[PDB]
């Protein structure tokens, strides 16, 4: 009865998180689309066959232009800073410097920028799962902590296969849960991504625990 | 009958009359109708005989989240290629065909989200 009051605080501190981070996949997709050209050119000409330094330089220009991509990364930290202080702050600051010191015509330099971007992007996705993790961890319903552990674990495997697809699925699935919307276990990518099915299974188990808690407060 | 020629995207090695010819080169990212770095420009009946003297070459890029069998392959102005992306990603404006053109690929090949 004074347990209900606490289960509600949990459910609430989760709904807040989900609402504040609601647009996370949508903003990372935005970043991805604006950069996929540059990272493509850099990987194309870091392969030892031929090189277009103009291209490999326009690639670098798109990353640094108006310190915007970096800024769009800072926006995503701001959302998760509450839950997981200075996960990303180190790697964003590191990535901004690498772009400043980015030397013209050095291809090994570019390719380091591309690899760093590609890491910083994954890190941003992982920080959503880490923020979920620290919140579900503090839940007094133990069945939910068990489900939440398993969900975090299967979530991270999905990220290592593909970070943007894992994230859009994780955001859609938890957004469904806290909005009392049925979770579909059937794949949304024709089973191309191998980690989806088991993550969706963890998501169903967590629905069950969540749905069990809510009935305590009726 | 054939006044000074300008090799768009190239130049001459160094008014004119029919029968005369000049040797010409193509800039780094272009080649000749024969596939070579150089060739003759010929004063003819219908102007200079290589109408379009230098033709662009396109290398198909690695595509993050794409089917990449074709990455590295070289194409020449006028040549097209079937692009396809992993589920979740796609070529923009629901297109499926990219074409090598004077200024390069059109549209640009990328798998977006
Ligand atoms: Zn390769």
UniProtKB/Swiss-Prot annotation, chain B:
Substitution effect: residue 100 to S: In CFHD; with membranoproliferative glomerulonephritis
UniProt PTM: Sulfated on tyrosine residues. Another study observed glycosylation at this position.
Domain of life: Eukaryota
Residue ranges constituting the Sushi domain according to the UniProt record: 1-55, 56-113
Localization per record: Secreted
Tissues in which the UniProt entry reports expression: Expressed in the retinal pigment epithelium (at protein level). CFH is one of the most abundant complement components in blood where the liver is the major source of CFH protein in vivo. in addition, CFH is secreted by additional cell types including monocytes, fibroblasts, or endothelial cells.
Regions annotated as coiled coil: none
Transmembrane segments: none
S-S bonds: 2-43, 26-54, 58-100, 85-111
UniProt function note: Glycoprotein that plays an essential role in maintaining a well-balanced immune response by modulating complement activation. Acts as a soluble inhibitor of complement, where its binding to self markers such as glycan structures prevents complement activation and amplification on cell surfaces. Accelerates the decay of the complement alternative pathway (AP) C3 convertase C3bBb, thus preventing local formation of more C3b, the central player of the complement amplification loop. As a cofactor of the serine protease factor I, CFH also regulates proteolytic degradation of already-deposited C3b.
Summary of subunit composition and partner proteins: Homodimer. Also forms homooligomers. Interacts with complement protein C3b; this interaction inhibits complement activation. Interacts with complement protein C3d. Interacts with CR3/ITGAM; this interaction mediates adhesion of neutrophils to pathogens leading to pathogen clearance. Interacts with complement factor I. (Microbial infection) Interacts with West nile virus non-structural protein 1 (NS1); this interaction leads to the degradation of C3.
Free-text domain note: Sushi 1-3 domain represents the minimal unit capable of cofactor activity. The property to discriminate self surfaces from non-self surfaces depends on the C-terminal region made of Sushis 19-20.
Disease linked to the protein: Basal laminar drusen: Drusen are extracellular deposits that accumulate below the retinal pigment epithelium on Bruch membrane. Basal laminar drusen refers to an early adult-onset drusen phenotype that shows a pattern of uniform small, slightly raised yellow subretinal nodules randomly scattered in the macula. In later stages, these drusen often become more numerous, with clustered groups of drusen scattered throughout the retina. In time these small basal laminar drusen may expand and ultimately lead to a serous pigment epithelial detachment of the macula that may result in vision loss. Complement factor H deficiency: A disorder that can manifest as several different phenotypes, including asymptomatic, recurrent bacterial infections, and renal failure. Laboratory features usually include decreased serum levels of factor H, complement component C3, and a decrease in other terminal complement components, indicating activation of the alternative complement pathway. It is associated with a number of renal diseases with variable clinical presentation and progression, including membranoproliferative glomerulonephritis and atypical hemolytic uremic syndrome.
Protein name: Complement factor H
Naturally occurring in which organism (per UniProt): Homo sapiens (Human)
């Amino acid at each position: 009865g004074a347990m209900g009051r606490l289960n509600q605080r949990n459910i609430n501190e989760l709904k807040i998180f989900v609402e504040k981070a609601k647009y996370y996949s949508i903003k990372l997709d935005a970043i991805y689309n604006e950069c996929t050209g540059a990272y493509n050119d850099i990987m194309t000409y870091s392969e030892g066959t031929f090189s277009d330094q103009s291209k490999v330089n326009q690639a670098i220009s798109i990353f640094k232009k108006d310190n915007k991509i970096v800024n769009k990364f800072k926006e995503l930290e701001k959302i998760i800073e509450e839950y997981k202080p200075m996960f990303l702050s180190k790697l964003i600051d590191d990535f901004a410097i690498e772009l400043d010191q980015a030397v013209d015509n050095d291809v090994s330099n570019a390719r380091h920028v591309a690899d760093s971007y590609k890491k910083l992007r994954k890190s941003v996705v992982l920080a959503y799962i880490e923020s979920f993790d620290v919140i579900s961890s503090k839940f007094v319903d133990s069945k939910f902590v068990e489900a939440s552990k398993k969900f975090v674990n299967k979530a991270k495997e999905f990220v290592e296969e593909n970070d943007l697809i894992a994230l859009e699925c994780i955001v859609k699935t938890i957004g469904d849960m806290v909005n009392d919307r049925e979770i579909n276990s059937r794949s949304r990518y024709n089973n191309f991504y191998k980690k989806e099915a088991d993550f969706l299974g963890a998501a169903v188990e967590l629905e069950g625990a969540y749905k069990a808690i809510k009935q305590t407060l009726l | 009958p054939c006044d000074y020629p300008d090799i768009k995207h190239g130049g001459l090695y160094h008014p004119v009359a029919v029968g005369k010819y000049y040797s010409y080169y193509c800039d780094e990212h272009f080649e000749t109708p024969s596939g070579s770095y150089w060739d003759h420009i010929h004063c003819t009946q219908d102007g200079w005989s290589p109408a379009v003297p230098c033709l662009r070459k396109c290398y198909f890029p690695y595509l993050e989240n794409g089917y990449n069998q074709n990455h590295g392959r070289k194409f020449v102005q006028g040549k097209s290629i079937d692009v396809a992306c992993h589920p979740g990603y796609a070529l923009p404006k629901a297109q499926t065909t990219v074409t090598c053109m004077e200024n390069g690929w059109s549209p640009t090949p990328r798998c977006i989200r």
